[PDB]
């Protein structure tokens, strides 16, 4: 129902493992998300970091979604006609890492995490489609 | 199956993927048409790519045309092509390249890979920082698991040509003359056979006089001989000291470092343990030792620093893309005619990074 249709649509093709819609305005809240996974824990702290003015310090400092450490690969989050930030996660030691894209609509972030070895390119495309679907539902 | 195409400020390299080496290496020049190697072999009677960026599409088009019909003599709509591009290539440009592929050449699938990324891959890594000097431009490109970090990428507008220019400036400052480019193939080949990189420049210059081996001799075509001395090392030193060329910029060693400094702290060590040199202009004897020392000086005294210079590093980019475009994983990565019909030229922005 409602916002979950979108999440579940994104999870449908085999290729991703978390996803989530978070309304960024006023106080940032999760509108829908994959149950009991990382994005469901995104905090107002880390959304403000995705939406704030400074667009460099995160490249050196890194950042977190939920409490998961992430490297910002390509930021065009606030840029007209692009709306995307690509990222990839960080593991201590040997664990795998995964790509992430976030796409900003009028009121929303769309967050998608690929599975292991899934190309940040496919992730970027999908997460951009869905967010375009949202963006002409005037959201 | 897949075609690989490396387009350079001066040299183009094309071939099939799975091949160990290209199958057409030719100058990136047009002048019936006059393209590539038929240009610099019937010279008397434009460089479409400039500092790695394409500046002229009709030309660029005609090179590709040449690449397919006259060079690789193959059918473009039968083959998924991997094209390479420069770090920070402007956006309208990645689009027009995509447009021209699927629409003019009607290709079935295509990808655009940052040149540096192939080279890092050619060496069996996915994290590292790569110094790539060709002919028109030099870039430093930090990389994390196969993804270039554009914010920390640096661009130094001096490579091969600037150094051929510089050698021809000093050699003429001595007396000799060259102003026809038939007489420049020459100075280029001198630069290539004889130039090297001083481990310590000042000490190299101050002890130059106790020569023994420094000195060398080169017979020009017109029978004439030239004596070459501290030029052997002085011209390539402009790579570390671009003041030698009149410009106010940092050298490759301080640039690499400057790139490492704009990256995420948690991979800096990994970038210092994995600095990879590529491109024709990194071919100089000594450059690795020199980069090693230069950055061991710039870094914390505890940073482990490995400079890596692979012996095939002039073809690292193309070798790199032959390996990549030949993996199965690569089709879940490519861009199809259908995706192209669905979404237009814009799709490069999403899919290639
Ligand atoms: N043995 C050598 N020693 C010194 N320089 C060399 C040697 N061989 C080739 N070069 C120089 O390297 C340059 C070749 O450039 P490269 O093969 O990296 O591709 P490219 O066309 O320069 O692409 P771009 O410059 O846009 O990256 C030429 O200027 C050439 O003179
Ligand atoms: Ca950190
Ligand atoms: Ca090149």
Q: What is the 3-state secondary structure (H, E, C) of chain A?
A: CCCHHHHHHHHHHCCEEEEEEEECCCCCEEEEECCCCCHHHCCHHHHHHHHCCCCCHHHHHCEEECCEEEEEEEECCCCCCCCEEEEEECCCCCCCCCEEEEEECCCEEEEEEECCCCCHHHHHHHHHHHHHHHHCCCC
Chosen CATH of B158-250 out of 3.40.190.10, 2.60.40.10, 3.10.20.30, 3.90.640.10: 3.90.640.10
Nearest residue to B294 via CA among B256, B262, B247, B264: B256
Question: Which residue's CA is the closest to the ligand 1 atom numbered 22?
Answer: B134
Q: Which value, to the nearest 10 degrees, does the dihedral of the CA atoms of residues B238, B240, B243, B244 take? A: -30
Find the CB nearest A59 among B145, B262, B352.
B262
> Which residues are bridge partners to A114 per DSSP?
A16
| Ligand number, closest to the Cα atom of B137 | 1
| Ligand number, closest to the Cα atom of A90 | 2
Whether B87 is in the pocket of ligand 1, judged by its Cβ within 6 Å, is no
Topology at the third CATH level for domain B1-115+317-353: Nucleotidyltransferase; domain 5 (3.30.420)
Query: d(Cα B219, Cα B80) in Å, to the nearest integer?
Result: 47
> What does the block give as tokens for B91?
């956006």
C-alpha distances in angstroms, A4 versus A85, B99, B186?
22, 36, 69
CATH classification of the domain holding A93: 3.30.450.30
> What does the block give as tokens for B260?
């490492």
Q: Which value, to the nearest 10 degrees, does the dihedral of the CA atoms of residues A68, A73, A75, A81 take? A: -110
Q: Say whether B349 and A82 touch across the interface (CB within 8 A).
A: yes
Find the CB nearest A120 among B147, B152, B266.
B147
- Torsions phi, psi for B156 (to 5 deg): -115, 115
Query: d(Cα A96, Cα B208) in Å, to the nearest integer?
Result: 53
Topology at the third CATH level for domain B116-157+251-316: Nucleotidyltransferase; domain 5 (3.30.420)
A121–B contact, CB cutoff 8 A: yes
> What is the Å distance from ligand 1's center to B282 Cα?
8
Q: Taking CB atoms and an 8 Å cutoff, what residues of chain A touch B350? A: 84, 121, 124-125, 128
> What does the block give as tokens for B236?
């390539």
Query: d(Cα B237, Cα B197) in Å, to the nearest integer?
Result: 7
Q: Say whether A86 and B151 touch across the interface (CB within 8 A).
A: no
> What does the block give as tokens for A6?
């979108």
Question: Which residue's CA is the closest to the ligand 1 atom numbered 3?
Answer: B192
Query: d(Cα A96, Cα A89) in Å, to the nearest integer?
Result: 9
Residue B218 buriedness (CB in 10 A; 0-12 / 13-18 / 19+): middle
Whether B230 is in the pocket of ligand 1, judged by its Cβ within 6 Å, is no
A66–B contact, CB cutoff 8 A: no
- Ligand 1 atom with least separation from CA of B12: 21
Q: Which residues contact B267 (CB under 8 A, 6 or more apart)?
A: A71, B127, B142, B144
Find the CB nearest A86 among B267, B339, B353.
B353
How many separate domains does chain A show?
1
A31–B contact, CB cutoff 8 A: no
Q: Which residues contact B351 (CB under 8 A, 6 or more apart)?
A: A121, A122, A124, A125, B111, B333, B335, B339
Whether B27 is in the pocket of ligand 1, judged by its Cβ within 6 Å, is no
To 10 degrees, what angle do helices B160-173 and B182-194 make?
100
- Ligand 1 atom with least separation from CA of B279: 18
Q: Side-chain half-sphere of B226: how many Cα atoms within 13 Å? A: 22
Domain locations along chain B: 1-115+317-353, 116-157+251-316, 158-250
Q: Side-chain half-sphere of B301: how many Cα atoms within 13 Å? A: 0
Q: Taking CB atoms and an 8 Å cutoff, what residues of chain A touch B144? A: 71, 73, 88
Query: d(Cα B330, Cα B323) in Å, to the nearest integer?
Result: 10
Nearest residue to B33 via CA among B53, B18, B55, B48: B48
CB B253 within 8 A of CB B298: yes
Whether B107 is in the pocket of ligand 1, judged by its Cβ within 6 Å, is no
Q: Which residues numbered 246-275 in B keep a CB inside 8 Å of some CB on A?
A: 262-267
CB B106 within 8 A of CB B135: no
Query: d(Cα B37, Cα B35) in Å, to the nearest integer?
Result: 6
Q: Say whether B264 and A61 touch across the interface (CB within 8 A).
A: yes
CB B41 within 8 A of CB B25: no
Question: Which residue's CA is the closest to the ligand 1 atom numbered 8?
Answer: B280
Find the CB nearest A121 among B262, B266, B333.
B333
Q: In a 3-state reduction of DSSP, which class is residue B240?
A: coil
Query: d(Cα B251, Cα B158) in Å, to the nearest integer?
Result: 10
Expressed as residue numbers, the domain containing A38 is 1-139
Do the first three CATH levels of B1-115+317-353 and B116-157+251-316 match, i.e. the same topology? yes
Q: In a 3-state reduction of DSSP, which class is residue B1?
A: coil
CB B126 within 8 A of CB B143: yes
Per DSSP, helices labelled H in chain B are 57-66, 91-99, 115-122, 160-173, 182-194, 201-206, 231-234, 252-262, 265-272, 287-298, 316-324, 337-343, 348-351
Mutate to test the interface with A, among B267, B333, B349, B352 (most CBs of A within 10 A): B349
Ligand 1 pocket test target in B280, B288, B315, B321 with most atoms within 8 Å of CB: B280
């Amino acid at each position: 129902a409602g916002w979950n249709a979108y999440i579940d649509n994104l999870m449908a093709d085999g290729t991703c493992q978390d996803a989530a819609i978070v309304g960024y305005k006023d106080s940032p809240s999760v509108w829908a998300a994959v149950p009991g996974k990382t994005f469901v824990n995104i905090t107002p702290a880390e959304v403000g970091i995705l939406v704030g003015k400074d667009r460099s310090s995160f490249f050196v400092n890194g950042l977190t979604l939920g409490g998961q450490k992430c490297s910002v690969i390509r930021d065009s989050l606030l840029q007209d006609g692009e709306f995307t930030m690509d990222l990839r996660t960080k593991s201590t030691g040997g664990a795998p890492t995964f790509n992430i894209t976030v796409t900003m609509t009028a009121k929303t972030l769309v967050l998608l995490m690929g599975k292991e070895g899934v190309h940040g390119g496919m992730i970027n495309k999908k997460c951009y489609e869905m967010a375009s679907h949202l963006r002409r539902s005037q959201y | 199956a897949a075609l690989v195409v490396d387009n350079g400020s001066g040299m183009c390299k094309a071939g099939f993927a799975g091949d160990d080496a290209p199958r057409a290496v030719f100058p990136s020049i047009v002048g019936d048409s006059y393209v590539g190697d038929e240009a610099q072999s019937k010279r008397g009677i434009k460089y479409p790519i400039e500092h790695g960026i394409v500046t002229n599409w009709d030309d660029m088009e005609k090179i590709w045309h040449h690449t397919f019909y006259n060079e690789l003599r193959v059918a473009p709509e039968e083959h998924p092509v991997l094209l390479t591009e420069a770090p920070l290539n402007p956006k309208a440009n990645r689009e027009k390249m995509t447009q021209i592929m699927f629409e003019t050449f009607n290709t079935p699938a295509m990808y655009v890979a940052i040149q540096a990324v192939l080279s890092l891959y050619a060496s069996g890594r996915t994290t590292g920082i790569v110094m790539d000097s060709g002919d028109g431009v030099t870039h430093t490109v930090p990389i994390y698991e196969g993804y270039a970090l554009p914010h920390a990428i640096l661009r130094l507008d001096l490579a091969g040509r600037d150094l051929t220019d510089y050698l021809m400036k000093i050699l003429t400052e001595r007396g000799y003359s060259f102003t026809t480019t038939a007489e420049r193939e020459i100075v280029r080949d001198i630069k290539e056979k004889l130039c090297y990189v001083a481990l310590d420049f000042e000490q190299e210059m101050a002890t130059a006089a106790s020569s023994s081996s420094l000195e060398k001799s080169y017979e020009l075509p017109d029978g004439q001989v030239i004596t070459i001395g501290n030029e052997r090392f002085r011209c390539p030193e402009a790579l570390f000291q671009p003041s030698f060329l009149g410009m106010e910029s940092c050298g490759i060693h301080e640039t690499t470092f400057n790139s490492i400094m704009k990256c995420d702290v948690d991979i800096r060590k990994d970038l210092y343990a994995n600095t990879v040199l590529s491109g024709g202009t990194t071919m100089y004897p000594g450059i690795a030792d020199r980069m090693q020392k230069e950055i061991t000086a710039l870094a914390p005294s505890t940073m482990k620093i490995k400079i890596i210079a692979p012996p095939e590093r002039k073809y690292s980019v193309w070798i790199g893309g032959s390996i990549l475009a030949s993996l199965s994983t690569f089709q879940q990565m490519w861009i199809s005619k259908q995706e192209y019909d669905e979404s237009g030229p814009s799709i490069v922005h999403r899919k290639c990074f």
